[PDB]
Amino acid sequence: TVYTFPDEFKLGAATASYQIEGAWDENGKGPNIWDTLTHEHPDYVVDGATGDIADDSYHLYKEDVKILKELGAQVYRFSISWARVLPEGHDNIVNQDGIDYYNNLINELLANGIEPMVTMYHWDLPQALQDLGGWPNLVLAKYSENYARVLFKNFGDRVKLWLTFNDPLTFMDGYASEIGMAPSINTPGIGDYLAAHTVIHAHARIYHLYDQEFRAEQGGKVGISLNINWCEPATNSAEDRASCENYQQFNLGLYAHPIFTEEGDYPAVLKDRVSRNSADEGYTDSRLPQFTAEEVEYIRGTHDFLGINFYTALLGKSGVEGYEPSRYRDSGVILTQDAAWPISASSWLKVVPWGFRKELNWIKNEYNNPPVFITENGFSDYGGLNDTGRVHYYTEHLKEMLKAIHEDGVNVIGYTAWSLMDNFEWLRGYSEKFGIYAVDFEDPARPRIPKESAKVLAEIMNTRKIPERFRD
Numbered sequence: 001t002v003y004t005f006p007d008e009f010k011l012g013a014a015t016a017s018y019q020i021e022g023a024w025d026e027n028g029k030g031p032n033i034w035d036t037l038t039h040e041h042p043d044y045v046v047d048g049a050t051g052d053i054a055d056d057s058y059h060l061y062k063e064d065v066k067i068l069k070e071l072g073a074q075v076y077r078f079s080i081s082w083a084r085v086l087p088e089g090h091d092n093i094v095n096q097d098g099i100d101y102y103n104n105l106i107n108e109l110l111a112n113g114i115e116p117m118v119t120m121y122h123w124d125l126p127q128a129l130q131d132l133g134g135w136p137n138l139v140l141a142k143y144s145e146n147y148a149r150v151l152f153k154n155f156g157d158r159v160k161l162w163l164t165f166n167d168p169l170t171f172m173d174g175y176a177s178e179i180g181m182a183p184s185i186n187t188p189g190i191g192d193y194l195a196a197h198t199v200i201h202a203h204a205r206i207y208h209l210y211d212q213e214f215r216a217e218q219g220g221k222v223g224i225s226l227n228i229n230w231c232e233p234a235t236n237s238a239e240d241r242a243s244c245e246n247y248q249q250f251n252l253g254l255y256a257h258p259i260f261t262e263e264g265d266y267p268a269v270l271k272d273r274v275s276r277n278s279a280d281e282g283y284t285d286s287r288l289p290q291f292t293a294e295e296v297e298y299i300r301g302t303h304d305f306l307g308i309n310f311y312t313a314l315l316g317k318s319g320v321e322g323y324e325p326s327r328y329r330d331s332g333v334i335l336t337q338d339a340a341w342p343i344s345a346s347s348w349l350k351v352v353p354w355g356f357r358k359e360l361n362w363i364k365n366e367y368n369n370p371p372v373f374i375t376e377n378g379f380s381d382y383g384g385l386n387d388t389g390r391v392h393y394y395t396e397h398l399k400e401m402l403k404a405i406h407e408d409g410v411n412v413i414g415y416t417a418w419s420l421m422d423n424f425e426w427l428r429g430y431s432e433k434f435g436i437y438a439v440d441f442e443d444p445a446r447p448r449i450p451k452e453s454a455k456v457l458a459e460i461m462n463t464r465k466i467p468e469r470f471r472d
């Protein structure tokens with residue numbers, strides 16, 4: 001039983017637009033912040049790589065559907081490129097080529113028995129909106145609503161699973177470094193919090209929009225995808241446990257407390273620690289933006305499920321480190337990783353499968369067991385089809401998730417592997433491989449070929465169980 005998926009549980013795979021599509025300026029698509037980063041700052045990216053072509057999924061979407069069908073995916077999670085649909089960011093111009101493209105992909109999926117799950121925003125802001133300041137400028141919340149309306153109107157008759165945002169914990173960091181994630185602006189501890197504030201407002205507007213203009217007719221569900229690492233106390237002390245709670249609140253709670261609790265608002269520890277630190281440094285005003293009571297009420301409850309992106313764990317101990325000002329310094333935890341944990345091809349990613357079960361329990365207890373859809377989980381290597389490390393990563397994480405479901409009563413409702421295929425891995429270029437399908441980036445045809453992990457995941461999806469040879 002503990003090795004069998006619930007009957008209604010949805011299994012599949014996931015991608016993101018800039019990581020896979022290419023066709024960066026084709027047929028009316030406008031420029032986004034990742035076009036800008038990779039064109040103007042190739043020094044920020046391994047190999048000076050760009051997403052100009054990537055997997056060429058703009059042209060090769062039918063091949064993506066073919067491999068999803070081979071895999072036996074029930075669901076495909078992909079994102080929509082804002083600037084492909086609204087090239088100027090604002091809703092004055094709708095690019096028919098972009099509408100057609102996503103319709104073509106959606107229709108192909110459905111014709112092959114695969115359900116579309118659509119992320120509206122996976123990091124590719126139109127440059128015209130970044131030029132207003134991007135996420136730190138609250139005007140983007142209404143622009144986001146208008147973008148979502150175009151998506152619901154054009155696609156919502158066939159799409160019933162939506163994510164407003166993917167991982168704003170990461171994308172807010174594009175406002176906390178001059179050399180990092182797009183748009184690579186150095187306002188740590190100030191602009192990243194403003195970005196988070198706008199994203200939360202935007203998410204809430206999009207959910208209310210769905211309620212008001214689309215839900216009765218379309219009958220779908222709207223969530224948000226949040227990334228969170230497990231944070232294990234470095235020792236069993238109460239002080240180290242406090243530091244790990246700080247970590248959860250400063251990383252997951254920053255977004256989930258306003259939306260998924262009955263109280264709403266930011267977590268108290270977030271408000272209080274930033275208030276105190278801001279005062280001690282001489283600011284008249286806290287660096288953390290505030291919600292009014294009316295805004296708290298508007299934002300809380302804006303969810304039909306919680307999307308979780310899970311990859312790894314950290315150790316946390318009591319203390320403070322990092323630069324002043326910064327979210328890490330404000331968070332009041334000293335973070336490390338254990339040298340004993342198996343490694344990947346990504347410095348930040350260690351294999352800690354039991355951390356997945358711990359995190360799912362933390363979420364269950366904090367948010368009153370919301371329906372959780374695992375929107376990303378996966379592993380990097382540098383290449384190869386006999387990807388034993390990735391196979392082990394998937395079988396262990398799936399076993400831990402099944403224990404969370406069956407032993408711990410966590411309401412996990414679906415799981416999409418990150419990623420369907422090797423793709424443009426942001427600042428790492430093509431150097432880190434996360435796919436279950438390999439892609440030859442030197443071959444203009446970009447063939448997709450199954451790794452061992454794709455074969456094992458197909459076996460899992462077909463049998464609806466963990467095969468005996470991978471059981472404890």
Ligand SMILES: O=S(=O)(O)CCN1CCN(CCO[C@@H]2O[C@H](CO)[C@@H](O)[C@H](O)[C@H]2O)CC1
Nearest residue numbers: 016166167170227309311348376425427434
């Ligand atoms: O710049 S660094 O400080 O050294 C490392 C930045 N983090 C940001 C958070 N990512 C995890 C969640 O982010 C996911 O990660 C996947 C694998 O990286 C991506 O392909 C997905 O698009 C993304 O949603 C991990 C890398």
Ligand SMILES: [Cl-]
Nearest residue numbers: 234235236237
């Ligand atoms: Cl101890």
Ligand SMILES: [Cl-]
Nearest residue numbers: 467468469470
């Ligand atoms: Cl066997």
Ligand code: NA
Nearest residue numbers: 094150153154
């Ligand atoms: Na339209």
